[PDB]
């Protein structure tokens, strides 16, 4: 069984690192902004073996014209934001949802808060407070998932690996329903 998974969300929100930690079980140390990329992952969930094609896309606005080339025949969307960037969450209904609903009507969307490790990081908290900001609250993420009619809401850290396996378990489960 093969499923196509596409990942989308603001530049630097952690999409590539999430994909590669799961697929290669290594955190990529060099940050290379994505135009497009592709990885395979194997997963066994609930006694079922599935092969995932992981379609990586550009977060950057400069590659908006190329990004719809990733959308055909998608089984599940991972729509990401970063927990250290309230701006990335605001972009969910303003940018990512209208695009994904346009090109992928009826494809299940999992809303994913990335970089969960930064929520309790004191250095992050203090930097954000200088800007009158704080890490995204889980509640804000859940409220957004309900607003955009997501299939599910999850948080993870590719850096620590927390919640990473669950992201792809839920994605595979969404994938298995059409
Ligand atoms: N602290 C922390 N940093 C992370 C985590 N995941 C990725 N990053 C870091 O954030 C930066 C962006 O990560 P990356 O995964 O490459 O972003 P992207 O969403 O794929 O970005 P783009 O390709 O749309 S430009 C990198 O420096 C990376 O090491 C995480 O879980 N925790
Ligand atoms: Mg990337
Ligand atoms: Mg069109
Ligand atoms: Mg939650």
Swiss-Prot record:
Q: How is it modified after translation?
A: (Microbial infection) Glycosylated at Tyr-31 by Photorhabdus asymbiotica toxin PAU_02230. Mono-O-GlcNAcylation by PAU_02230 inhibits downstream signaling by an impaired interaction with diverse regulator and effector proteins of Rho and leads to actin disassembly.
PROSITE patterns attached here?
RHO
Its subcellular locations are: Cell membrane; Cleavage furrow
Question: Mind listing the GO molecular function terms for this protein?
Answer: GTP binding; GTPase activity; protein kinase binding
Main localization category: membrane
**Gene Ontology terms describing biological process:** actin filament organization; apical junction assembly; cell migration; mitotic cytokinesis; positive regulation of canonical NF-kappaB signal transduction; positive regulation of cell migration; positive regulation of lipase activity; positive regulation of protein-containing complex assembly
The record gives the membrane topology as: Lipid-anchor
Does the record's keyword annotation contain Nucleotide-binding?
yes
Glyco sites are at 31, 34
Q: Which GO terms describe its cellular component?
A: cleavage furrow; cytosol; endoplasmic reticulum membrane; extracellular exosome; nucleus; plasma membrane; stereocilium
Q: Which SUPFAM superfamilies match?
A: P-loop containing nucleoside triphosphate hydrolases
For this chain the motif Effector region maps to 31-39
Keywords linked to the UniProt accession: ADP-ribosylation, Cell membrane, Glycoprotein, GTP-binding, Lipoprotein, Membrane, Methylation, Nucleotide-binding, Prenylation
| Cell membrane found in the keyword field | yes
Oligomeric and partner information: Interacts with RTKN. Interacts with AKAP13. Interacts with DIAPH1. Interacts with PKN2. Interacts with ROCK1 and ROCK2. Interacts with ARHGDIA. Interacts with RIPOR1.
Spell out the protein name for this chain: Rho-related GTP-binding protein RhoC
Protein's gene: RHOC
